[PDB]
C-alpha cells in the first residue's frame, strides 16, 4: 500500500491498517479463537471474521 | 482434521463393540469398508440384527448435545 508519514510513532513502530491486519493474520485470528472458545468450530470463526 | 479427531472421540463416548460396529460400517480410521453381512461375520452374528446395532447407535446419538458440536461441520 501507500506510506504516510505520521509523526508521533515510537522508533520502533509502524502504523498499520486494519483491514490489511485481518487479511493478513487471518488464520492467527482463527486459532485464537477457537482456543478462547469463542467459536465452537474453524468455519464459525470464518463467519465470525466475516 | 477437526472433524476426523472430535469423530474419534465422540465414539470413544460410545460402547465398545457398537463403536466398532459404526467404524467397520464406514471407512472411519480404516480402509476398505465390508458390507453388513461381513461384519456380522466378524462378530459371528451375520443376520439383519447387525443393522439392528447400527439403527440403535444411530438413534442413541440423534439425542442433542453430543452430535450438535459436530452439527457445526454442516453448512
Redesign the interface.
Known amino acids: 500500500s501507500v506510506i504516510t508519514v505520521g509523526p508521533y510513532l515510537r522508533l520502533h513502530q509502524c502504523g498499520l491498517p486494519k483491514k490489511m491486519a485481518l487479511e493478513l493474520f487471518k488464520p492467527f485470528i482463527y486459532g485464537k479463537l477457537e482456543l478462547r472458545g469463542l467459536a465452537?468450530?474453524?468455519?464459525?470463526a470464518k463467519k465470525m471474521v466475516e | 482434521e477437526?472433524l476426523r479427531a472430535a469423530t474419534h472421540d465422540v465414539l470413544a463416548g460410545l460402547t465398545a463393540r457398537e463403536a466398532k460396529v459404526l467404524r467397520m460400517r464406514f471407512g472411519i480410521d480404516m480402509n476398505t469398508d465390508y458390507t453388513l453381512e461381513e461384519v456380522g461375520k466378524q462378530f459371528d452374528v451375520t443376520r439383519e440384527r447387525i443393522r439392528q446395532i447400527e439403527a440403535k447407535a444411530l438413534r442413541k446419538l440423534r439425542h442433542p448435545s453430543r452430535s450438535e458440536?459436530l452439527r457445526?461441520?454442516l453448512?
Open positions: 465452537t468450530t474453524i468455519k464459525a | 477437526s458440536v457445526s461441520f453448512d
